């Protein structure tokens, strides 16, 4: 399926494309204008023309494994160079500058 990962057949296109790692709502609406599917179809109901345009538009976009590997490269970069922000990446303490005597409970 489209980027090597599924989209659900029984949703609309705008939100079935959200389940691809790298496309949210607004890049999905930027796609389907360029593709011309008019945002009101199931993806169980498309044509091979109409879904192939979606495929190669997304092939032009930085989506599936590129995003994960490059964001891991950024995180490993500022872990390895030193970089207190990567120290927060490592330890499980919040990165953006946030109080830690209380919650900080996404990270530990």
């Amino acid at each position: 399926r489209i980027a090597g990962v599924d989209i659900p057949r029984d949703k609309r296109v705008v939100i079935s494309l959200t389940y691809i790692f790298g496309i949210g709502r607004t890049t999905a609406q930027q796609v389907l204008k360029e593709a011309g599917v008019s945002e009101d179809t199931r993806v169980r109901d498309l044509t091979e023309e109409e879904l192939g345009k979606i495929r190669d538009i997304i092939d032009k976009l930085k989506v599936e494994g590129d995003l994960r590997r490059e964001v891991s490269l950024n995180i490993k970069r500022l872990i390895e160079i030193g970089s207190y922000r990567g120290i927060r990446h490592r330890r499980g303490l919040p990165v953006r500058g946030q109080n830690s005597k209380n919650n900080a409970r996404t990270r530990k």
């Binding site: 970069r77 500022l78 160079i81 030193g82 970089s83 207190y84 922000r85 120290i87």
Partner: protein
């Protein structure tokens, strides 16, 4: 810091360009942590003041888009 430029202090820029007009030397004891790293700093070992000591850090190709005080935590913890 958007389109005005990057930021550095003028004194640290002066010291680094004196260092760069001939060749590298010993560490630069520098209390400025607020200043970004220009690509012309790379190789210059500089001593950032953490609050109580001067920590030496050697600047690489990656350590550019950040600032100096990213390479000196101020709070010791365990």
């Amino acid at each position: 810091s958007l389109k005005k430029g990057p930021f550095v202090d003028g004194h640290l820029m002066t010291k680094i360009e004196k260092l760069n007009e001939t060749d590298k030397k010993q560490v630069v004891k520098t209390w400025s942590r607020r200043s970004t790293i220009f690509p012309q700093f790379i190789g210059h070992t500089i001593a950032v003041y953490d609050g109580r000591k001067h920590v030496p850090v050697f600047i690489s190709e990656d350590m550019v888009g950040h600032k100096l005080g990213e390479f000196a935590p101020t709070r010791t913890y365990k």
